[PDB]
């Protein structure tokens, strides 16, 4: 009913109050049934609880639909009841909220993405799409994806929601353990950096921990995003009593933490486990009417995997090995869909020092798309590191980007208006950074020409507001093509001096002459001395890796 523009307006004016736990309230009323089923079996109980929260002061209540998606309901033999479940939930909540806001509550499926589980991006996507269609049709004032523990599943959810409606206010939440990590390894900074650039309106943290525990985790989150913030802590740390887990933190003890979150810029405050109407009533009194606080986010250049965030504030080794070009064995296996061989190449490269992995599938026409999707989802989880997606076809590109678990690096976009704009828009929609190759219709032979390509690229990036999401690749040419490597060094220095990260397809310098390892080493050392911030290289080359480390030690970049 109310759109994201309208909700954003309200948020800019005042911090809002959410509601509390529903499950335990239903239980206090003698109903232990699956919450979602109550929307059909005992709608009066659902309404009663919504009203208890509204009367407590809640500015917004959540629909009783946390587990209402086909994938989750299937586990209870209720998949065929998805429609009446969600429609009734929205109607019941609307009836209770009256004028107040009603957000559609959508939790995770409980299924982990392949390779941890057996689910691919597309299925999660369709799964979330269906529930959002119902809520939008029934008139929710926003959607909040609650308690997500994995970024790929969360990414699929928001992309699905946004595809159904560009106007619905979207809120994405992740839950963290006491060590500040999601089930699959994501920390606050990673979550903020990966999701801040997606088309959602707010980010948040809910459940798992109490008020004090979430505080530092919330602070880290607030530093990397300028989106609206939400927090719903559990009512303290769990304690087991009569053989059951309870969250004893009383209203006053919970409510006193409100100021701390407010000082950190929170825009919506609510409570999770153990939160009762009694707790909300006090939250209302304590919160009152306040205008949110301004924040100003930290801006950094980084790419990510579910468990690792790689910031370009140090030389980044990008493993070049998962590339069938000139690799007879690998090429044949990729064609037959061999995942294990690629998994092994990834693992060994990281074990040797690669922090990011370039992934290319040779002649894309000869590769199965499902294979590509399985590999893109798989590597970040099993190898633990982010990927540089080395893909040519725009078609495959979009499929890889939407299924990528984190914020990736996209390999090369030549200096061509059409190609750049096209790849920029895909990255804007799905997230990610871009390697811009300094060439277009032909290869530059000088530093002068490379500079022209750089200047033309900056112009294009500038008008598409994408200058802060790029890494420049000057374009190393083979020494067997009079590739004048010195012109490449000048270019690296010039670009570095302007504040931009850089990289090179290292091996291309010696792919036409023996003792390539030594040419590769010499160039890398020289490149680093000119500001080179990374390189697509062979981490299995002991000579190159050891000399690389020595260089960094000598230039005082590490020990």
UniProtKB/TrEMBL annotation:
EC number: 2.1.1.13
Positions bound to (6S)-5-methyl-5,6,7,8-tetrahydrofolate: 390, 411, 473, 508, 516
Binding locations of L-homocysteine: 22-23, 147
Keywords from the named record: Amino-acid biosynthesis, Cobalamin, Cobalt, Metal-binding, Methionine biosynthesis, Methyltransferase, S-adenosyl-L-methionine, Transferase, Zinc
Keyword Transmembrane on entry: no
One Gene Ontology MF term: methionine synthase activity
Record's keyword annotation contains Amino-acid biosynthesis: yes
Record pathway: Amino-acid biosynthesis; L-methionine biosynthesis via de novo pathway; L-methionine from L-homocysteine (MetH route): step 1/1
Main enzyme class: transferase
Residues that, per the record, bind Zn(2+): 207, 234, 272-273
Recorded catalytic activity of this chain's protein: (6S)-5-methyl-5,6,7,8-tetrahydrofolate + L-homocysteine = (6S)-5,6,7,8-tetrahydrofolate + L-methionine
Disulphide bonds in the chain: 207-272
Domain Pterin-binding: 315-556
GO CC annotations on file: cytosol
One GO process term, biological-process aspect: methylation
Domain Hcy-binding: 4-287
Swiss-Prot/TrEMBL cofactor(s): Zn(2+); methylcob(III)alamin
Its biological purpose: Catalyzes the transfer of a methyl group from methyl-cobalamin to homocysteine, yielding enzyme-bound cob(I)alamin and methionine. Subsequently, remethylates the cofactor using methyltetrahydrofolate.
Family label: Belongs to the vitamin-B12 dependent methionine synthase family. Belongs to the methylamine corrinoid protein family.
Protein name: Methionine synthase
Organism: Thermotoga maritima (strain ATCC 43589 / DSM 3109 / JCM 10099 / NBRC 100826 / MSB8)
Residues of the full protein shown: 1 to 559 of 768
């Amino acid at each position: 009913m109310r759109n994201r523009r309208e909700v954003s307006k309200l948020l800019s004016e005042r911090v809002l109050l959410l509601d509390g736990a529903y499950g335990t309230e239903f239980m206090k009323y003698g109903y232990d049934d699956l919450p979602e089923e109550l929307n059909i079996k005992a709608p009066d109980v659902v309404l009663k609880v919504h009203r208890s929260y509204i009367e407590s002061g809640s500015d917004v209540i959540l629909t009783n639909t946390f587990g209402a998606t086909r994938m989750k309901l299937r586990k209870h033999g209720l998949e065929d009841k998805l429609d009446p479940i969600v429609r009734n939930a929205v109607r019941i909540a609307r009836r209770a909220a009256g004028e107040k806001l009603v957000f559609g509550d959508i939790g995770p499926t409980g299924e982990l993405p392949y390779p941890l589980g057996s689910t691919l991006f597309e299925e999660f996507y369709e799964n979330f799409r269906e529930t959002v269609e119902i809520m939008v049709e029934e008139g929710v004032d926003g959607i909040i994806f609650e308690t997500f523990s994995d970024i790929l599943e969360l990414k699929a959810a928001v992309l699905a929601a946004r595809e159904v409606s560009r106007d619905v206010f979207l809120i994405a939440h992740m839950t963290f353990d006491e060590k500040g990590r999601s089930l699959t390894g994501t920390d606050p900074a990673n979550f903020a950096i990966t999701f801040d650039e997606l088309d959602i309106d707010a980010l948040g943290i809910n459940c798992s921990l109490g008020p004090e525990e979430i505080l530092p985790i919330f602070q880290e989150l607030s530093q990397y995003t300028d989106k609206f913030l939400v927090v719903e802590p559990n009512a303290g740390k769990p304690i087991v009593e009569n053989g059951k887990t309870v969250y004893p933190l009383k209203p006053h003890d919970f409510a006193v933490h409100i100021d701390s979150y407010y000082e950190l810029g929170v825009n919506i405050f609510g409570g999770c486990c153990g939160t009762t109407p009694e707790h909300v009533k006090l939250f209302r009194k304590v919160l009152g009417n306040r205008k949110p606080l301004q924040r100003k986010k930290k801006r950094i250049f980084a790419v990510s995997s579910p468990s690792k965030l790689v910031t370009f504030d140090h030389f980044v080794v990008i493993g070049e090995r998962i590339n069938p070009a000139g690799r007879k064995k690998l090429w044949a296996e990729m064609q037959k869909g061999n995942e294990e061989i690629v998994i092994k190449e990834a693992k060994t490269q990281v074990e040797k020092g690669a922090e990011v992995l370039d992934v290319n599938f040779g002649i894309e026409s000869q590769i199965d798309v499902r294979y590509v999707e399985k590999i893109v989802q798989t590597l970040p989880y099993v190898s633990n590191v982010p990927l540089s997606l080395d893909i040519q076809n725009v078609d495959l590109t979009e499929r890889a980007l939407r299924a990528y678990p984190g914020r990736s690096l996209f390999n090369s976009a030549k200096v061509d208006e059409e190609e750049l704009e096209m790849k920029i828009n895909l990255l804007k929609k799905y997230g990610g950074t871009l390697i811009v190759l300094l060439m277009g219709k032909d290869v530059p032979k000088s530093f002068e020409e490379r500079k022209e390509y750089f200047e033309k690229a900056l112009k294009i990036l500038e008008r598409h507001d994408f200058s802060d999401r790029v890494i420049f690749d000057p374009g190393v040419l083979p020494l067997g093509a009079e590739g004048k490597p010195v012109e490449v060094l000048k270019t690296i220095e010039f670009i570095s001096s302007k504040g931009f990260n850089t990289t090179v397809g290292l091996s291309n310098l010696s792919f036409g002459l023996p003792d390539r390892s030594y040419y590769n080493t010499a160039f890398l050392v020289l490149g680093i001395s000119k500001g080179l911030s990374s390189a697509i290289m062979n981490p299995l080359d002991e000579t190159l890796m050891k000399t690389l480390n020595a260089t960094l030690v000598i230039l005082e970049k590490k020990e």
